[PDB]
Symmetry: D2
Subunit: 321 residues, 4 copies
Amino acid sequence: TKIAMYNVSPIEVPYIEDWAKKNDVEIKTTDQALTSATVDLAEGCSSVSLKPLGPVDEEVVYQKLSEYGVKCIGLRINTINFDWTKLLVTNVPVYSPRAIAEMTVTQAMYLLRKIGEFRYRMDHDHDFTWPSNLISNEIYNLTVGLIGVGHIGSAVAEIFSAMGAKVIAYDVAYNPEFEPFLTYTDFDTVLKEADIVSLHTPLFPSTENMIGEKQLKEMKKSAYLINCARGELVDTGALIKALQDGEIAGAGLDTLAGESSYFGHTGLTDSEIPEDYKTLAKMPNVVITPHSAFYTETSIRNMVQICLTDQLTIAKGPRSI
Amino acid sequence: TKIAMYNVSPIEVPYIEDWAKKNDVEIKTTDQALTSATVDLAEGCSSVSLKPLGPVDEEVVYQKLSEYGVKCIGLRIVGFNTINFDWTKKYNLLVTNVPVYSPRAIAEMTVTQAMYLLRKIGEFRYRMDHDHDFTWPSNLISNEIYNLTVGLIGVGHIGSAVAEIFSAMGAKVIAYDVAYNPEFEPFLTYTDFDTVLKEADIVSLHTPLFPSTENMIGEKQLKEMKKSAYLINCARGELVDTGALIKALQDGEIAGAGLDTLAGESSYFGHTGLTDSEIPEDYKTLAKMPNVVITPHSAFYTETSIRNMVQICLTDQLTIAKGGRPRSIVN
Amino acid sequence: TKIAMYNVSPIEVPYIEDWAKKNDVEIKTTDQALTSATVDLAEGCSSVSLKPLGPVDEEVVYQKLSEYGVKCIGLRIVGFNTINFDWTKKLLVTNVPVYSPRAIAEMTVTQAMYLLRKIGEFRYRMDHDHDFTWPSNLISNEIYNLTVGLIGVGHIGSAVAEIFSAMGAKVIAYDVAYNPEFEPFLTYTDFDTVLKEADIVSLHTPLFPSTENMIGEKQLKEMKKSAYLINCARGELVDTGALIKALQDGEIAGAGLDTLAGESSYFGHTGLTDSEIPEDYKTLAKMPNVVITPHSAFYTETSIRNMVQICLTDQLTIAKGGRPRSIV
Amino acid sequence: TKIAMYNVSPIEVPYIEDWAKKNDVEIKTTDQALTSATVDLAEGCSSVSLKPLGPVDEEVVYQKLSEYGVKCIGLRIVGFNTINFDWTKLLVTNVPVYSPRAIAEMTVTQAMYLLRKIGEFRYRMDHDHDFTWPSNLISNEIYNLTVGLIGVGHIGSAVAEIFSAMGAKVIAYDVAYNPEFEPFLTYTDFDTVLKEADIVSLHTPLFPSTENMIGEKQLKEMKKSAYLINCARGELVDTGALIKALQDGEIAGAGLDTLAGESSYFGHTGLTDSEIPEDYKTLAKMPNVVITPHSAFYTETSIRNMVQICLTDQLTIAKGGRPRSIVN
Ligand SMILES: NC(=O)c1ccc[n+]([C@@H]2O[C@H](COP(=O)([O-])OP(=O)(O)OC[C@H]3O[C@@H](n4cnc5c(N)ncnc54)[C@H](O)[C@@H]3O)[C@@H](O)[C@H]2O)c1
Ligand SMILES: NC(=O)c1ccc[n+]([C@@H]2O[C@H](COP(=O)([O-])OP(=O)(O)OC[C@H]3O[C@@H](n4cnc5c(N)ncnc54)[C@H](O)[C@@H]3O)[C@@H](O)[C@H]2O)c1
Ligand SMILES: NC(=O)c1ccc[n+]([C@@H]2O[C@H](COP(=O)([O-])OP(=O)(O)OC[C@H]3O[C@@H](n4cnc5c(N)ncnc54)[C@H](O)[C@@H]3O)[C@@H](O)[C@H]2O)c1
Ligand SMILES: NC(=O)c1ccc[n+]([C@@H]2O[C@H](COP(=O)([O-])OP(=O)(O)OC[C@H]3O[C@@H](n4cnc5c(N)ncnc54)[C@H](O)[C@@H]3O)[C@@H](O)[C@H]2O)c1
């Protein structure tokens, strides 16, 4: 049984070949996306594997899939037209909650210890002293509020709770297994009481610009906001005003609304990076990362491997469908 | 019962009044040093309390203290170098300090530095701001902390607290200490020094500074570390030989370093209005490195610390007024 | 809106009455099972709610249900097997899959620590031999020096793993299925290695034909002499005959059980004659290195609350054309 | 450098020998006390090592030791009351901390067993033949409970860390303040701990001021539903009061490792009825009490450390050290 992959990064190659030989299956691969100009690669193979940057819209692709004997399209991550599929589809729902959880905790502690602000003072003011307004506090004295708790949210809960912090959380769905780490409560109580506020809900119309002006004035003036989820959750202009006028103390971001313009590209002009990024990027009480929270070996390993072991059980008779 | 307080900063004042009311004690305060000029204030006090910026130089100070009947000189800091002990015995004066005020303050900075480095955050920021590059390269892929071993040199109050946290997050923690403390076995495994260096993904220093510990981390020691590994020093600068560290980072012997403290720091840390001349190239070379993080010896700098440096000090003196003899006495 | 409830116990009531005044909903209840007789209280109801001990085996019950405009039969437990699903082509069915994993996790851990500390064994020499000395073979160890092994890791296994890991123990595990979210607390490995390496073996798989008698003679011999077997899952996973033989010979050191094959005879019953109680229970219950509880690992306020409230909330969702995920 | 050891028990032998081999030292041993017959063994030796059951009160042994030229008497316990300090004027060392988690873990084990009502369930099963689940034996997850500690040193702090990891709220009263401990608990006053805790655990040393610290008035302050744990020293509790409080429903149960008056029967076999007290027997019959015979300490780690910390102390002595375990 043969498999054909698409969208592969050099970092993904070792784990493919490490699996190919382990599960004794022949594998053909390529960095380019699946289109009508690259379906021919799927001759023989039981399954195609993709990690899409965009819609696979054109639909002779699907025709050609099932004519070649492809049993399944398995994604490594809504970019699939579900009507043409009626082949089985799969996805990778969970690869590493702890990767994103760990970035969340990291960015929150950095800000809390006010490291960005000390380095500004040191490097721009040549000022190595300890001002009253830069005093810190221990995590166990603080309380962390989570907006949404799923796979990622709860891991964030388990970590902070392990460090002695009180965690409180608003979700539309009650999970009892999470009760050892957090107290469920309403949205508003989360914003009011919380010393760190961290976003872990999905992206939907009802969830777009969830955090804007109202919400930021509702937070504690000493609080930090953390978004390691999706940029469209935060109204950026509002964030930026809130930060200037000091309605919060800081922000840690792994993502921004309208980020696809420049996140993932290289060699950009000043003119091709937006001014809102340049503004946040300059604030000592902000930290930004290029949507990298997911980026550990475990994530790369499981994105590739979970999907291929899926594909082998479909070349015979799993929950990923 | 009365106590005189010297060197009080605004930030202390609320912990001071807070403490003077919980206990039945009258406190005189001054933001000034104790010298022959200000020793008066000590009148009818059982203890004075300091946070010196410099030596208590004057014999007169000590003679006039015991003549007032002041039992003890309490420091609000670990360091007692500023007190003349010849004269404290000559004048029958007790001295106490505050060695442990908030171990987690420091332990939490330690973890914080480790994680930032581990997640290559400063290295991404670099590519972002200066190479106008927002992609994910291969050599900047991260790992989760439960997959790593953390190696502590010295496991005392701060080390054990580092151990409990990283252990709570699932790392394997191994450590070298000259002293065996069973208390700490749930959180770490003792090993020998060579092993810690060789096997650890993170090496964090937590030993005191002695002649026998000066330059503990030098060239030979950075060679023994992993290419991927990170050196954390939130203890004392002199433990690390900087020249050597700079070279090791440049040669890619280790991957990065988190520093709360440098050798030779005292001539710039906690100073302002510095000009380029007075900040060394040592610091500057390190400070441009994206895989280095530096704080100005602020690991201790939390509200608990400041509060506890007032209160652990003041209650010690309350027990001396009562006839107490606490273990914070410096002998 | 209206809902009728069967099999209700006094411990359930406050929670039901709490939910009722909160969601503005009428609830009529009865301690007794759903049958031909008692189907009469389900009039006008959007839903029924059951915690059954027997099959709902009578067809008439179902017909009159869909005759009253009853939309769903909601279980307050995991097992939907006390329902005929042929006849439910008339009726939706919901259950409560997870209500409090930690309830079962905390019982597992408690039973393990007890045997590990050898308290039943101490009390035996104290009470029967008048002996309060400390012999060599009753020495104990710290949990953080032991490695704990799980056959099966779902909602309960993972909770068990989270706890032991939190206490500083090493946890290993065998599962047919990989759950990346559990790596911070354990290491996956094969069935054999779990048994060979563990100091405490605890069982968390579900009852299936292929899982029935998972632990027998061969497996107990492979465990360490000093190891402890925990079953807080399902009793048919363990061959009681073999277990007894293993315990008597010193092939394992002790066992904690919340459940036993055949238990339906006496678990749940009172005033029992010594005939009514089987010989294998009486043999295990006499051993100081055994501890047994009568299938109450689940038995906390949280589980009682959630079994009632999750189920009701679901019914309400369905009273408004809901479809929640707990449709079965 | 040669060492005499007294009071050794089979369990200690391996670590004695393993340590003897690790360091180039010779040890001689004997299971009996150091008295004026067995003193002869310590000839040529640099130090002695005891683990006492009663006083070394023969003056000859002291002066026979310094004549043979021994430099220290090392104990393998905390207690030094047994050495007469008049005759040491010779050095003396004890082992104050060998395994705090051994005791903290007993504390936790006893508390969970009580919390889960296992004794109460076993009583109904074996004496009432009743295997059902009653309202009053509903249980709770630990993370929903709050734990009160009187005293927080080596042991009480480990209890705090463990229960904290399990997600309980820990609150504590201590006369001394330990910043190191705030991630695990919240300090408060004594009354408050008694008033608000679902489990009260005692961890203070015994002093004239601390004896009968928990008595009639304190158990009235606690909750109907709270458990008292004493894995510390028995004189800390008024057994008469505790018994009467358990009888009256003032608390819901207790876990004891020690009892006021135990040295009459703990560590003895085989005793008459006259020799085991009424209070002990009353307590032992209560399905909501658990009692172990001062075995909290009794682990591999403890045994090993008791031996190895004392011996290395004796070696630092022979080389000129004088370490901090010296008690004069
Ligand atoms: N930054 C990265 O590199 C990265 C990588 C992967 C995922 N993510 C993001 O992390 C976020 C959480 O992902 P996850 O794996 O935990 O998925 P998830 O579905 O398990 O978590 C979402 C949780 O939020 C809850 N929720 C849904 N709607 C809500 C609302 N309106 N208000 C509050 N809560 C609501 C859900 O009940 C669920 O428990 C997602 O937005 C995901 O895209 C980021
Ligand atoms: N960054 C800050 O603001 C800050 C604040 C407080 C303390 N510190 C520094 O952190 C360090 C440790 O602090 P602490 O409170 O834990 O001290 P400590 O006495 O509580 O612990 C020190 C540990 O080091 C061990 N040790 C001694 N010599 C050793 C050696 N040669 N090799 C290995 N281990 C050795 C000791 O046995 C002890 O366990 C000190 O240097 C202290 O000054 C920094
Ligand atoms: N003591 C009680 O009162 C009580 C209460 C609730 C549940 N239980 C029992 O607890 C057990 C586990 O429940 P859960 O909620 O953890 O279930 P689960 O389905 O959530 O977890 C089961 C795990 O079993 C693993 N598994 C399934 N079959 C396996 C096999 N053949 N070999 C190895 N692993 C396998 C699966 O990967 C799954 O992850 C069940 O037997 C349940 O009936 C007992
Ligand atoms: N169960 C066993 O077999 C066993 C074994 C070892 C120790 N112990 C007992 O456990 C107890 C504690 O041991 P440790 O090692 O933790 O000792 P410790 O010295 O470390 O701690 C005692 C704590 O009690 C606090 N304390 C003192 N007086 C107090 C008071 N009046 N009120 C409140 N707190 C007070 C002290 O500040 C100290 O923090 C001791 O009684 C010891 O006897 C029992």
